[PDB]
Symmetry: C2
Subunit: 191 residues, 2 copies
């Protein structure tokens, strides 16, 4: 999994493209009324039994990266996304590979209002892809519990698709949620 710029990857020939987004919102809620949730981050159980971000393959000879993302989000997350514009401003990074297959993955990150996230969750059951490609929506625990494992560390022990584990860790950094040491720490507690 290699880093590459948007413009450079879009000039490539014979590559498959995918788009995936992290939809997130701040929250004041405290787990057990003591542990702050801080922010809601959405991921999913996929048909293949792995955790992933919503999104999928985009044909760039046909539609833009944003256009492809939009369609796949509405299919996977549901009608509530018709009110949700993920634009070029939301674009973050692009990784490329040639093995097993020549594949470029794009990652977006988009902040929403809490009630937006909540509407998305409420309406996900009505998605075309519910109970098929998408087996359920999930929130990422951002805290470590007193036992030093429960929460994010333990969650990172789940089974992730492609580079999704790495994209999330990037977002944790990008959104200033965890310091590099906190991130390294979480990864150790995870074993």
């Amino acid at each position: 999994p290699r880093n590459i710029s948007r413009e450079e990857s879009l000039q490539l020939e014979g590559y498959k493209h995918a788009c995936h987004a992290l939809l997130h919102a701040p929250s004041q809620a405290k787990l057990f009324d003591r542990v702050p949730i801080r922010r809601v981050l959405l991921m999913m159980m996929r048909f293949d039994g792995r955790l992933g971000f919503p999104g999928g393959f985009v044909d760039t000879r046909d539609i833009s990266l944003e256009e492809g993302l939009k369609r796949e989000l509405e299919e996977e997350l549901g009608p509530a996304l018709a009110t949700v514009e993920v634009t070029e401003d939301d674009y973050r990074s692009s990784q490329v590979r040639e093995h097993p297959q020549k594949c470029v993955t794009h990652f977006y990150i988009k902040e929403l209002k809490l009630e937006e996230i909540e509407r998305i969750e409420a309406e996900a059951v009505n998605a075309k892809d519910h109970g098929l490609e998408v087996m359920g929506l999930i929130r990422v625990p951002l805290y470590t519990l007193r036992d030093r494992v429960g929460g994010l560390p333990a969650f990172l022990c789940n089974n992730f698709i492609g580079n999704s584990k790495s994209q999330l860790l990037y977002a944790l950094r990008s959104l200033k949620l965890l310091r590099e040491d906190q991130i390294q720490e979480v990864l150790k507690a995870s074993h």
Copy 2:
């Protein structure tokens, strides 16, 4: 393992109840792979997968009344009308080095629409976004690559003897035979 009447009068041990709710399904994945059955589990606040339910004080209302409560709390209001009776009981396990606990497992077949209504109102549960970070369905099939679906699913991080219990259910409901179950774990483990 353990036993029900042997378990319910221990001494000091803490008691928990969890349930697998499931329904038959005609749906097919890529218009190819049958779903067969919809089985509910969840992502917990601690980052692990588990069944809904929780602790129930043995002296404070029956094992079923503990469960039904923890169900409405975690899965939501829809459950008030779910009837998780004594006949829905299935097993108990004893542990010690952890907290000394008795886990009671319950399997109850519902109608699909009922599962659908449970997933749809789950976002209204007292514990949505607190104890319960989201419901999921258990993929029962195995993909052409012979890893995706259930075997990949068993590599996720499960609480307690949650995995154990699920394997039990799959045999309990004649969903997979013992060798098929073994095939799945051998694919899973690697």
